[PDB]
Design a protein around this ligand. Sequence first.
Ligand SMILES: CC[C@@H](CC(=O)NCC1CCCCC1)n1c(N)nc2cc(Cl)ccc21
Length: 377
Amino acid sequence: FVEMVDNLRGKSGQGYYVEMTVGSPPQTLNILVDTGSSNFAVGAAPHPFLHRYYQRQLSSTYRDLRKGVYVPYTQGKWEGELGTDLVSIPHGPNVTVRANIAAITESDKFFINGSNWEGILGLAYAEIARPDDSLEPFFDSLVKQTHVPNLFSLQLCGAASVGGSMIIGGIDHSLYTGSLWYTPIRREWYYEVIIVRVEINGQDLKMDCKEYNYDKSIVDSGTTNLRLPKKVFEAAVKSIKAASSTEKFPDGFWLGEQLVCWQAGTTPWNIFPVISLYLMGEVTNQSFRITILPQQYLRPVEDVATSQDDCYKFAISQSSTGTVMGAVIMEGFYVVFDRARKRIGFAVSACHVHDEFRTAAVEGPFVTLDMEDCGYN
Ligand SMILES: CC[C@@H](CC(=O)NCC1CCCCC1)n1c(N)nc2cc(Cl)ccc21
């Protein structure tokens, strides 16, 4: 696993990418690690944002599937040609698999201007694969062709430049401290989990637990913020406002539209509360909690090429599509995607940033009744 440690790189807010090789002879590409999608889709045309792109025709092991794919989302679409080719990960397991590859020939608002990645590794399940669930995802192809165990674990470490580790086929003990606790994957499509309880400095948020998972709660490496449903976001902010009422901040700060600055390098971490998220456990009526520090949700401002000091951005935002546990959560925790056993493990990361008096935690067990009722149908 030592060869797989520190195999992730990226820029702040632009995601985490891993080095991958496709085709014969091998073409080296930087590929976004994405637990929020299920397609292995790489740029295959010279879009001006891209450093590199996949050249289908120069690979002797490339096979044209003779079928297109069209993936629209919100502000954009990505599209291209479906095919298969030989894929390997230089700083991964020593194997080569024939996997599905979507050669992106056109996209709108997909690639990020200034980033160093040229494609995405959809690490989620077949059901959200496009055009349909018969297009086998990369990790499915990996496990079915090799003896690599059906799991991977992510340690995202966040610093402009960021690093991390994607351990494929196991768990590295030295990437976490304390104990690993597991939450069941509710449904195999996104990495869907169930939040049963939320606390702010120990104070229960007092919401119907169905609100925390409306209409969904996912673990996504392709998202930066901790995104919460409107009604949950409202209460959490109102609670964070209350905990830190010794200082008032502009209304735009809570919306992520304005920055807040203190004389470097202190900085009142103490007035900001810890946020505990209770997740459904492996056992009936059993749950566990993950505690995030003010240091996870107050991020040093991305691009301050004019504005020095300390300065911060509020990294909790509202969502209309359910809870998203992004880098805000994931950078605080070593996250194990145990696909073979339908579960996701959380343990305090060895690379999380802690303050002088408080510590991030994964603790349990807790008694929580009707946890299944917190999931939305
Ligand atoms: C479901 C969550 C969203 C979050 C998002 O919008 N992320 C930024 C997105 C990541 C994938 C490359 C393009 C930018 N999301 C993720 N994780 N992967 C996605 C891929 C597509 Cl085609 C659309 C939305 C995606």
